[PDB]
Amino acid sequence: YQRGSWAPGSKHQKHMSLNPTMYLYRFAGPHGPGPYVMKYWWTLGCFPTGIERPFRLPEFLASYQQQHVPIEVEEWLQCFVKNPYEELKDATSSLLKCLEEVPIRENTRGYRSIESGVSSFAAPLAQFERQLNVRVPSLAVRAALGSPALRERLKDDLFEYNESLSACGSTPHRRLARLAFDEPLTLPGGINNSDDPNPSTSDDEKKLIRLLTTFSEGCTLKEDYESAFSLLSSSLGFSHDDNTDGVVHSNASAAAILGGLYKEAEFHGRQAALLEPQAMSSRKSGGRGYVLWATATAYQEDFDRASRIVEKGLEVFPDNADLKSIQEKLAGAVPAASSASPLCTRMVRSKGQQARALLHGSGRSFDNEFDWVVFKNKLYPSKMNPSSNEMGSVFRRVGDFGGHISTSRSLEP
């Protein structure tokens, strides 16, 4: 009897005569509530022994007492938010005030030098985008400062857009204010608080996108495409005229092939296929509106749809060297494309999907469909899978509910 100590959280054996316990299922150890007695503290409410008492206070001072604003303060606060045209004309000036001071990436041979740190401008940049709602990965603006071709184009595309924001006003703002201003009404939604809707992509709204691709140009130079795809396709809310719309629709599809998404590479290219031809087809931009909407199919393995778009690009646009080579690039896979044409053989090509299945993909011995099926955002243990009545699943033994015999079986209702 009584080999260890006398506390209930002791280590060795005990006896119920000498040291009579109260049967405490699971209590907290001497070093704090582990993650097992907290599975109750957030579901049961209190520790499962019942003896401990649920001091839920400092959470109440975390959520509620923080989120309390009386009625006579609620309606007035929004009248006190900042003028994000300012933290757009102030941060962009500060963001530059650091982007100028970031070291030129070293160039010593024998070993790749390490890119400059990013804590310098992470704080102002956090302000720029947070008002724009287009979140940029610091790597884009950390490899850009590193690349010898982009360290200057990027920084100066900021100095110039900063110019075309401290000269004009934040035009994607007024677009939201002119809603509250047009459709004749004496209410403009403030005096527009952005200077001193039927416009096209304004000056800034073009230079805004300008540095976004120049942001997304550092992404490709580091080859992180599916974050670049969130940079380009986010600027897609900034073009309202179909000239630049097709340009930025060419950028997104010029970043979806690498990113691995070969379906959306068509759509982003098919819009480049309906907005491109307005200019003289002699420049290398004329042909580009169609190639992506047909290269994305030479990448999607359906060569017969691709065999027609490169045909439709021949008629309109006279000679696009890229579109010309795809005409013959489709003659090397013949017949190995058309003879060997199965409807399902899709040999996954790039890394953007090789990487996106290392994450977000099913695993083995965990995260598979045999561990915890999720159903309506709620995790269900593998048994309770409403998408199968296979063995193990509790649906095998539901019954018939005293209602109609709906089964012909004998031992298996």
């Binding site: 010593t108 041979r109 024998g110 070993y111 390490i114």
Partner: protein, 694 residues
């Protein structure tokens, strides 16, 4: 096509497959297919046809396979795996080690028993069998199984009757042949020219485990090199015959045979003189072996301006006059070379020269000659990416502007902490060269102040930058902490330049470029510290030959005494025999040498190699290996997959049935790395596909 051999003459009785490939078409296969499974079916396919091939082809294929070997270390070290059945590990020699042990087993039958006439005819063949039999270290088969020199295996040496090491038991490959080759040198050589009498004398030294050559073997050629001389009368002056002495004197230095007469002539006859006109002193120059060696002088001819072989050779002779006698012949050789305006003779004479100065007792006279001859300049011109720095390190004044270099009694650079005074001048920073290469090169003696402010100084060794550069590269980064450092030597540079071009495999020579790109372009940026020849002479102990294996250590034994605050690390491979300078590299035992040898101010810095303390104060951190990611073993043989090559699998597929999914035809067990097709096998009743790349 499946052609190339023909079945034995009498078919239904013997089915053995002959051979009919041309030696070229074996070498082409040997080369275009360097994989082990093709490089085995070439050695074996050749050793079967070793009795037909001509004395010239025997010269070629032997001389050819050496391209796969390397004088440095383990000969047949083509291991398969290090099995870990028990606690410690043991090593398993691959099919390619058993292929040369098989090849050498077919040379010791053709040349010893069934054709003893084959090797006397062509003299250049024996002079190639010998050198081959040295590269394959057949006097020491244990290293064909040994991976870490510190961990010597006895796999090929020691067997136990319980049944361990039976099949790879006591190995005697050429010990039959290697000892018939000497029965051919004693008692013939009439058809041997002096270029081969030397090489044969160089074979029996190299092949021996330590270079001793069983002197009756050697002495049978020296007895024959005098008869080649007596017909000229020991007045030889062919300038190429004056080279075969500088080689005959480098040998008989590795062997250690001490014959003054060859030095009594190669030097010029200065000894046997300075032995005339004595008032009262010794007669050291003679050391007469007159009945054994012939009186020899060269002539009134050149008698001066020797070659590199001679200077690295006279290093071993401990005689005081011979060095001052050979210190002008280095000036003249550095005069004639400079005036001739040749690069190769200008570097060769220096890297073979420092070995001479590193032996004189007067370190001052050794340091004087090192700056009057721009040693820190001409040496570094050679090293691949060093030409940039050699320029800057040769700035017009501060190449070596007579630094304080205050040596005390005993020769030890007791300038430490009294050269830390520097004469108070701060060893200036940025100088000139507007392109902002303006940061001055960091010679040690000029920058000994920095190493004091350093937190942990690093030493580089030519191994740590071999097999990968991912360990130096990290230290290249930490250089810009200000607290750290990095010290490379002009020896470690040179000893990297060798393995930069003279490397067994391109995967290794490519490194020593990328391993010298950084250090030559981290020195020009004023981050690392180059210990130049002028300072390797400063730190080394006078009289001891301190190569890069000891410059890594005498530096860590200098600064672990003359600046004890800072750490010291050693970028090297755990396989270097210099990871333990106590076990290897220790000096002759002596009663006076203590364990306090390291810190005592009166002892030479290499006296501390007789202690485990020097290894204790010098750390040896593996800074950072490449990642531990496994290589693609999906293409190698797998004892688990092997059971699936022929496993019936009908009920596995439904629509897309193939003929035999698992079986890669032509390969061994579906292993796309173990390729065998079009290599010579025999299976008269099973198909085989011809060779294609992958």
């Amino acid at each position: 096509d499946l052609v190339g051999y023909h079945v034995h003459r009498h078919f239904p009785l013997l089915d053995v497959l002959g051979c009919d490939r041309s030696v070229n078409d074996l070498l082409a296969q040997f080369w275009n297919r360097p994989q082990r499974e093709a490089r085995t079916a070439t050695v074996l396919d050749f050793a079967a046809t070793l009795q037909r091939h001509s004395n010239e082809e025997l010269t070629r294929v032997l001389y050819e396979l050496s391209s796969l070997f390397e004088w440095d270390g383990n000969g047949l070290q083509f291991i398969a795996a290090k099995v870990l059945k028990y606690g410690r590990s043991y090593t398993v020699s691959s099919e390619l080690t058993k292929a040369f042990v098989q090849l050498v087993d077919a040379m010791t039958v053709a040349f010893v028993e069934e054709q003893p006439h084959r090797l006397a005819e062509s003299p250049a063949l024996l002079a190639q069998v010998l050198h081959f039999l040295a590269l394959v270290k057949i006097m020491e088969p244990n290293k064909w199984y040994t991976l870490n020199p510190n961990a010597p295996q006895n796999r090929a040496d020691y067997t136990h009757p319980r049944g361990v090491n039976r099949t790879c038991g006591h190995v005697t490959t050429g010990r039959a042949l290697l000892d018939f080759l000497e029965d051919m040198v004693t008692s013939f050589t009439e058809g041997w020219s002096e270029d081969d009498i030397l090489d044969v004398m160089a074979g029996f030294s190299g092949v021996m485990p330590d270079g001793k050559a069983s002197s009756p073997v050697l002495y049978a050629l020296l007895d024959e090199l005098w008869m080649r001389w007596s017909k000229v009368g020991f007045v030889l002056s062919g300038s190429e015959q004056a080279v075969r002495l500088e080689r005959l004197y480098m040998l008989l230095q590795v062997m250690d045979m001490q014959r003054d007469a060859v030095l009594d002539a190669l030097l010029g006859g200065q000894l046997r003189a300075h032995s005339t006109a004595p008032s009262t002193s010794t007669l050291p120059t003679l050391f007469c072996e007159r009945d054994d060696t012939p009186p020899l002088t060269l002539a009134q001819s050149l008698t001066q301006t020797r070659g590199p072989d001679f200077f690295s050779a006279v290093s071993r002779d401990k005689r005081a006059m011979v060095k001052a006698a050979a210190l002008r012949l280095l000036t003249a050789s550095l005069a004639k070379a400079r005036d001739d305006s040749d690069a190769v003779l200008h570097q060769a004479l220096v890297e073979s020269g420092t070995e001479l100065l590193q032996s004189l007792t007067s370190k001052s006279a050794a340091l004087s000659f090192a700056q009057r001859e721009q040693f820190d300049v001409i040496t570094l011109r050679a090293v691949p990416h060093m030409a940039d720095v050699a320029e800057r390190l040769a700035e017009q004044r501060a190449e070596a502007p007579f630094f304080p270099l205050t040596a005390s009694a005993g020769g030890l650079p007791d300038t430490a902490a009294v050269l830390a005074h520097l004469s108070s001048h701060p060893a200036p920073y940025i100088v000139l060269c507007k392109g902002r290469r303006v940061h001055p090169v960091r010679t040690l003696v000029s920058n000994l102040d920095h190493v004091a402010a350093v937190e942990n100084v690093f030493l580089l060794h030519s191994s740590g930058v071999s097999k990968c550069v991912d360990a130096l590269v990290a230290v290249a980064r930490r250089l810009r902490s200000g607290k750290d450092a990095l010290i490379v030597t002009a020896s470690c540079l040179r000893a990297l330049q060798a393995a930069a071009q003279y490397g067994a495999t391109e995967k290794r020579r490519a490194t020593a470029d990328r391993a010298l790109d950084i250090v030559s372009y981290e020195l020009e940026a004023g981050r690392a510290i180059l210990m130049p020849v002028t300072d390797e002479l400063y730190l080394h102990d006078a009289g001891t030959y301190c190569d890069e294996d000891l410059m890594l250590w005498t530096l860590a034994a200098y600064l672990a005494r003359d600046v004890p605050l800072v750490k010291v690390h050693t970028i090297m491979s755990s396989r270097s025999r210099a990871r333990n300078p106590q076990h290897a590299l220790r000096g002759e035992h002596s009663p006076l040498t203590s364990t306090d040898d390291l810190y005592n101010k009166s002892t030479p810095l290499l006296q501390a190699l007789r202690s485990k303390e020097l290894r204790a104060v010098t750390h040896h951190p593996v800074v950072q290996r490449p990642v531990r990611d496994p290589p693609q073993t999906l293409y190698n043989v797998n004892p688990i997959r092997a059971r699936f090559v022929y496993r019936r699998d009908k009920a596995l597929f439904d629509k897309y049935h193939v003929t035999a999914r698992n079986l890669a035809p032509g390969f061994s067990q579906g292993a796309l790395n173990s390729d065998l097709r079009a290599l010579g096998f025999y299976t008269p009743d099973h198909p085989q596909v011809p060779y294609t790349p992958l």
